Design a protein around this ligand. Structure first.
Ligand code: NA
Length: 601
């Protein structure tokens, strides 16, 4: 109906007994009561600090909230005990409510020492509070032993927010709560902890990935369980894996590029929980997270209409500071969002009318052109339900002196639509890497995407490495070849330690894949490390590949995270070489995320 979005604070730092409140968890009890849990950090720090698990309750659907009650109290006096990071799981079949959390003594996540002995004050224990009266009273259990099938699981904690209960297939009824372990090899993984007997016993399934962290799982329209993870390896995205079973295992983990994430927690739920398998309502997902990849801000709610393959809908609920966010389906049709606005924990309620709309994911290919040219690219739209929209619009988002126009024929129920985008870029347009936003305006809601228009740069798919002085390829992937893949996240690294290799006169050459008229080169520093940054450099070109001529350019580039230009008077060359003479802070290695050659295709 009319678009709804309201919010109020449940916890405000300093008031009501704690200097810090953090780590949100939202649930709706079997009888319509909203339950919100979070840490009360007397220390403002997580485990092993004396944190307490708290709870506020709303019986009128979320408008008014009760007093702040303690679910698990931490001991500030020695010996220090703490409880942290709550996560609710509601067994819709029996009525039991489970609040999972970290139980700390002397060690936190990174300090936990091997062992399952509840008594050993050196392991981060896995606790569960159970309640049979809708959350009023609780029963605590330490299940660290039930869930540590491998003596190597040195550490663990339950990912905050809220767990699930399968509805479909042969495991309908199973409860699932996600964890993050630290295996024997020091690696962080994702593991599903589940119960087939309504929580009396909890067993752990098969672990997944490397560089995982707080992860979330959801039931797809077909019983498949999608897993959406924070990436501890900081690639600015969410990793995802899928499972098709009940003794839980997921396939390979890959990165979702439609999910920009600053390496933070995120929420993903079924928009219509009780929809039947296969139906269109069972295919609708809601995901909340911080859209910024460099910051914990720009809280945006995204919608998927095909089990998470496409994410056309999106809206910002908090443009400002936004860290952890957790979602829940309300019995009235709306959704409850409990998050961290920086002031403590806030509660929000919104409905789908407020999100924008139309499940019409669309695609527009990436375009490469020369400055001063006009290019027309096709648009492909894939339409949903009550969608006979005779008049849809296409609003592109680019640079002011760029003429961009687009059109799409009408949308017909469950049909594919066509259209096209005409881009015109001026002759004084500086070389490559341009993001263009497209927005499908319709009277039934929004749908948006982004494509790339690269100007005056050669094709990396035609490039190869002619030579390199050293490549770190044992301890890590510092391959010379990671410079030509279109990914800032991957980098070439000089043979670093764990082998005392050569010092600074470092270099790399690219085989352009034929003779081109080139007039420049752009390089992006390695993004998440500052000691293998190139300072002084010199460029050399060649066309026979053996006799190099130059330097055609020389300079010292900066500490800039964006691409930096090495310009020179146009010339023909089949290969280009970058000689790095020094590192910005005098350290011994060179690392390059990406190399771009400016020229004519
Ligand atoms: Na790269």
């Amino acid at each position: 109906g009319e678009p709804l979005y309201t919010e109020q604070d449940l916890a405000v730092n300093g008031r009501e007994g704690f200097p810090n409140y953090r780590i949100p968890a939202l649930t709706v009890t079997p009888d319509g009561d909203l339950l919100a849990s979070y840490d009360g950090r007397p220390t403002g720090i997580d485990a092993p600090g004396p944190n307490s698990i708290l709870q506020r309750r709303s019986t009128d659907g979320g408008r008014t909230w009760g007093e702040q009650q303690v679910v698990s109290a931490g001991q500030t006096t020695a010996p220090i005990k703490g409880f942290s990071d709550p996560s609710y799981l509601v067994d819709r079949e029996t009525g039991t409510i489970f609040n999972f959390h970290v139980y700390s003594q002397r060690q936190g996540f990174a300090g936990s020492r091997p062992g399952t002995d509840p008594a050993d004050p050196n392991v981060l224990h896995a606790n569960v509070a159970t309640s049979t009266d809708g959350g009023l009273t609780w029963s605590h259990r330490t299940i660290t032993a039930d869930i540590t099938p491998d003596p190597g699981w040195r550490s663990r904690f339950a990912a905050s927010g809220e767990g699930i209960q399968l509805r479909y297939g042969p495991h309908a009824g199973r409860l699932i709560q996600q964890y993050t372990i630290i295996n024997a090899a020091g690696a962080f993984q994702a593991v599903s902890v589940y119960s087939d007997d309504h929580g009396r016993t909890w067993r752990a399934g098969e672990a997944v990935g490397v560089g995982m962290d707080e992860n979330k799982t959801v039931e797809l329209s077909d019983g498949r369980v999608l897993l959406n993870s924070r990436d501890s390896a900081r690639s600015g995205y969410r990793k995802v894996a899928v499972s098709t079973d009940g003794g839980h295992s997921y396939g390979p983990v890959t990165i979702d590029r439609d999910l920009p994430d600053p390496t933070n927690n995120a929420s993903i739920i079924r928009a219509f929980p009780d929809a039947p398998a296969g139906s269109a309502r069972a295919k609708v997902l809601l995901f909340s997270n911080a859209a910024s990849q460099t910051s914990r801000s720009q809280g945006t709610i995204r919608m998927s209409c095909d089990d998470g393959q496409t994410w056309p809908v999106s809206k910002v609920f908090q443009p400002g500071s936004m860290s952890y966010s957790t979602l829940t389906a309300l019995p009235d049709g709306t959704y409850g969002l409990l998050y961290e606005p920086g002031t403590g924990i806030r509660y929000a309620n919104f409905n789908l009318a407020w999100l924008g709309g139309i499940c019409a994911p669309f695609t527009i290919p990436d375009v490469a052109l020369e400055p001063g040219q006009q290019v027309t690219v096709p648009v492909a739209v894939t339409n949903q339900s009550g969608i006979a929209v005779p008049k849809p619009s296409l609003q592109l988002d680019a640079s002011p002196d760029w003429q961009v126009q687009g059109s799409v024929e009408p949308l017909m129920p469950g049909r594919q639509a066509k259209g096209q985008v005409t881009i015109t870029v001026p002759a004084g347009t500086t070389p490559g890497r341009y993001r263009v936003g497209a927005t499908l305006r319709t009277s039934a809601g929004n749908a948006s995407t982004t494509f790339t228009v690269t100007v005056g740069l050669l094709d990396q798919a035609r490039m190869s490495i002619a030579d390199v002085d050293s490549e770190e390829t044992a301890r890590e992937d510092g391959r010379a070849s990671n410079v030509i893949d279109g990914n800032p996240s991957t980098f070439w690294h000089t043979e670093w330690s764990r082998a005392d290799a050569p010092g600074y006169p470092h270099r790399i050459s690219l085989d352009l894949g034929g003779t081109h008229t080139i007039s420049g080169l752009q390089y992006t520093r390695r993004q998440n490390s500052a000691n293998e940054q190139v300072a002084d450099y010199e460029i050399y070109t060649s066309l026979n590949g053996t006799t190099w001529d130059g330097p055609v350019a020389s300079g010292r580039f900066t500490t800039s995270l964006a691409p930096q230009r090495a310009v020179f008077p146009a010339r023909d060359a089949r290969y280009i070489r970058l000689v790095a003479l020094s590192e910005q802070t005098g350290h011994k290695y060179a690392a390059v995320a990406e190399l771009e050659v400016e020229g004519q295709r």
